[PDB]
Amino acid sequence: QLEETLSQYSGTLLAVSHDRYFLEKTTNSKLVISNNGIEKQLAAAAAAAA
Amino acid sequence: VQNVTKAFGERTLFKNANFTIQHGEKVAIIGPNGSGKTTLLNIILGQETAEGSVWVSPSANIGYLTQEVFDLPLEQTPEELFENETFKARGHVQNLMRHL
Amino acid sequence: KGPVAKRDVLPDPIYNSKLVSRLINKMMIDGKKGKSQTILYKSFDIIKERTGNDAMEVFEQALKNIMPVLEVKARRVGGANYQVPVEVRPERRTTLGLRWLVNYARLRGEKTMEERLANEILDAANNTGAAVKKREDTHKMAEANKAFA
Amino acid sequence: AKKSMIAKQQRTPKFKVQEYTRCERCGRPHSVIRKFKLCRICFRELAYKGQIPGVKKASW
RNA sequence: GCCGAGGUGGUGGAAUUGGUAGACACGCUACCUUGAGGUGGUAGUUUACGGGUUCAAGUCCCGUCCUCGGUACCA
RNA sequence: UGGUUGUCGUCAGCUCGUGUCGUGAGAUGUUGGGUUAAGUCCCGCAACGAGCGCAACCCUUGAUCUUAGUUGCCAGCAUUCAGUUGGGCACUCUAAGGUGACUGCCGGUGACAAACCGGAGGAAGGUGGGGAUGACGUCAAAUCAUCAUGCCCCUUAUGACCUGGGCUACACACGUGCUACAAUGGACAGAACAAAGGGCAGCGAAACCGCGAGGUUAAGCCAAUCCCACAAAUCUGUUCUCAGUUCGGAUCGCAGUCUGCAACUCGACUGCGUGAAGCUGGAAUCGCUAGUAAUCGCGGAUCAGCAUGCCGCGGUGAAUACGUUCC
RNA sequence: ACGGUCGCAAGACUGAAACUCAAAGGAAUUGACGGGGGCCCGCACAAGCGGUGGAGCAUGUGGUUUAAUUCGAAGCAACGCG
């Protein structure tokens, strides 16, 4: 139910979750922390779209 | 959060990581193991070597949830803990919210 | 009826490009080229400062990342709502790139559209960015509906 | 009430502010032009009938 | 009079004490669409009553009123 | 009912003469091929023509030649606080007469036509941009309240005067509009640029006073002179830093100003204080193809006074038109 | 419908009247319409830019209150209209 209602939540959420299936209801943009700081992703953003 | 840098002695996590998020959006923060996920929110929300600039809205009411359970006023009753003003503030606000 | 064509003005006093004046005519609110030229030159001076390059090459690189190859138009037959993928002719590639730069720059939100357009160019350069959401999503819509052409 | 009201305008009232503009050819206020001292429709009619020495059809 | 049953919104009606002028399907109202109706789309209105128990009551409890039916005087 | 309009619609249609075909209603022309913005024009045709429509002539803008120089203009000529003076009609300007763009000329396509596509010239290129112009008719559309009106009705009243109120009501809906929700922003200071139009019991300089709305005396002007009239967005500095705020101004209290017998219902404006809803809007829906949309001020009618409406005026000034699949 | 014949049945065949209307109908013409076809055109659609619908007020109109809220307009083509 927290997976459900946080989708109907009215924005400004910073959802750290080590799950892969919880964030499928609570994600529009991602912050992938990686080597040498953040990576502000808005999609998968892998393999450097060409 | 502009030009942020976070280091622990020689353990360096953040370096010049410029991102800016406004209201009304779902921000998922993913770290495989130790990406500072828990560390960023502390250095979003606090001082202590957020090297750079972290600006946040002064009139926003940030409700915070921790990973670690070590922020309880221990040995208190949830009666005294939860702010229950008059009559249905125990029931219609609170005790229904607990049992339900 | 038939196709009609248009024109645009060649130079800019700093950065002598056609397409930079095309962006000057874009993002003009209420008939004010002066505000858009000031915003534009302060933004390109930030792009020249913060990254030690000439902002022409960063700006064209960002364009190359945003310019979509494939629009997907509509073709409704019956009750079907089919979408048909269209090879975009490169004029519309440039103009959709400029619209997406301008729209998602002012849609970002920072403490001037100087900074917003500059950071949007800096994101579309290092391809992950806000207009490139629209690039990726249009290519995914053309990739899924490629059966019609 | 038409000729009575025309007659009342043709009077001198108690006060100068009771004075209002009126037709002089086809009795009505609301759009009597001060220059011609004429009602609007009567101005259109007479200006069609070749009178009123200034006005022709306008284009510019 | 006695026994048994139900008393909610304009309607029929679910709800094991935990939030309902109403949650569910209709009506109803304001708008949209249409030439104007209908369909369709958007938003909107204290539990028969009175007194408790309870942190909380449609519900648990004590009383009153109404209606269905069985059980009687009489034709 | 006359008269005068909306609408389809600036759509390209609508008819008639004479002829022929059909018992007749009708048909024909007006259909077909190309072409157009066009029933435009050509070609073919049982039709040949014609009329109302379309276009053109009319007004404006785009440029140049001539005339005409003050109140307009200042290039060289010196004086000027100042185009003020003398000087000059060159230049802009003004307002008259012209010239000018006609597919005219080239090449290509296409019946050889009509026309179309590119090219050259040119300020202007294919009705150059716009206006005015609104066919037969449709809605028994609108107007008996601008007027005139046939018929019917009232008449010491359904007519007339006067004051007062109302046409500004207010729980609600609904058209059009204005202002915002903000950093391309708000406030403050500096610099510049307009067009069009108005002025006789009117426009009203300048000076003075008032924070301001304005006030008192008054020059010039029946106006290319003088006034309205200090354009504003813009540009450049200072300042705030993303909040229901240095956003926005509703609403409201008090004290004022002007107009006018008189501003209570029921005027505009100013000053102080208060500062709301609103952080870009659901279904749906509208305008616009270029100096347009967006935006910024200016002007004039009406009128003593009342403009967010309307009618014109300039300022900056875009994005897009692949196409006709859909409404 | 009644009667009759045929039929296992369903029904077939034969077949009126009271009553009711001043039309029903055919073919063809001119139009209009089609959730018929073709061709074309218009900010009509698409391609865009800005809005309206949300808020505040100005303004006009419906309802309602009224002593009167004067009269006229009412889909496009009434509703900052006379």
From Swiss-Prot, chain A:
The gene is vmlR. Belongs to the ABC transporter superfamily. ABCF family. ARE2 subfamily. Recognizes and binds in the vacant E-site of ribosomes stalled by some peptidyltransferase center (PTC)-targeting antibiotics. Makes contact with the PTC and both ribosomal subunits. Induces conformational changes in the P-site, which allows it to dislodge the antibiotic from its PTC binding site. Binds to ribosomes either directly following translation initation or subsequent to E tRNA release during elongation. The lineage of its organism: Bacteria, Bacillati, Bacillota, Bacilli, Bacillales. The antibiotic resistance domain (ARD) is packed between the 23S rRNA and the acceptor arm of the P-site tRNA and inserts into the peptidyltransferase center (PTC). The C-terminal extension (CTE) contacts the small ribosomal subunit, positioned in the Shine-Dalgarno-anti-Shine-Dalgarno cavity. It comes from the Bacteria. Binds within the E-site of the 70S ribosome, where it contacts ribosomal proteins L1, L5, L33-1, S7, S11, the 16 and 23S rRNAs and the acceptor arm of the P-site tRNA. Signal peptide: none annotated. It is found in: Cytoplasm. It comes from Bacillus subtilis (strain 168). This is Ribosome protection protein VmlR.
UniProtKB/Swiss-Prot annotation, chain B:
ATP 2 binds at G31, P32, N33, G34, S35, G36, K37, T38. It is found in: Cytoplasm. Disulfide bonds: none annotated. Induction: Expressed during all growth phases; expression is higher during early log phase and decreases as growth continues. Expression is dramatically increased in the presence of antibiotics virginiamycin M and lincomycin. A monocistronic operon. Disruption phenotype: Hypersensitivity toward the antibiotics virginiamycin M and lincomycin, mildly increased sensitivity to erythromycin, clindamycin and oleandomycin. Hypersensitivity toward the antibiotics virginiamycin M, lincomycin and tiamulin, in this study has no effect on sensitivity to erythromycin, chloramphenicol or linezolid. Recognizes and binds in the vacant E-site of ribosomes stalled by some peptidyltransferase center (PTC)-targeting antibiotics. Makes contact with the PTC and both ribosomal subunits. Induces conformational changes in the P-site, which allows it to dislodge the antibiotic from its PTC binding site. Binds to ribosomes either directly following translation initation or subsequent to E tRNA release during elongation. Belongs to the ABC transporter superfamily. ABCF family. ARE2 subfamily. This is Ribosome protection protein VmlR. The gene is vmlR.
From Swiss-Prot, chain C:
SUPFAM superfamilies: Ribosomal protein S7. GO terms for biological process: ribosomal small subunit assembly; translation. CDD domains: uS7_Bacteria. It comes from the Bacteria. Keywords: Ribonucleoprotein, Ribosomal protein, RNA-binding, rRNA-binding, tRNA-binding. GO terms for molecular function: mRNA binding; rRNA binding; structural constituent of ribosome; tRNA binding. It holds the Pfam family Ribosomal_S7. One of its GO terms (cellular component) is ribosome. HAMAP family: Ribosomal_uS7_B. Belongs to the universal ribosomal protein uS7 family. NCBIfam families: rpsG_bact (TIGR01029). Part of the 30S ribosomal subunit. Contacts proteins S9 and S11. Interacts with VmlR. One of the primary rRNA binding proteins, it binds directly to 16S rRNA where it nucleates assembly of the head domain of the 30S subunit. Is located at the subunit interface close to the decoding center, probably blocks exit of the E-site tRNA. This is Small ribosomal subunit protein uS7. It comes from Bacillus subtilis (strain 168).
UniProtKB/Swiss-Prot annotation, chain D:
One of its GO terms (biological process) is translation. It comes from the Bacteria. GO terms for cellular component: small ribosomal subunit. The keyword Transmembrane helix does not apply. This is Small ribosomal subunit protein uS14B. Binds 1 zinc ion per subunit. Belongs to the universal ribosomal protein uS14 family. Zinc-binding uS14 subfamily. GO terms for molecular function: rRNA binding; structural constituent of ribosome; zinc ion binding. Signal peptide: none annotated.
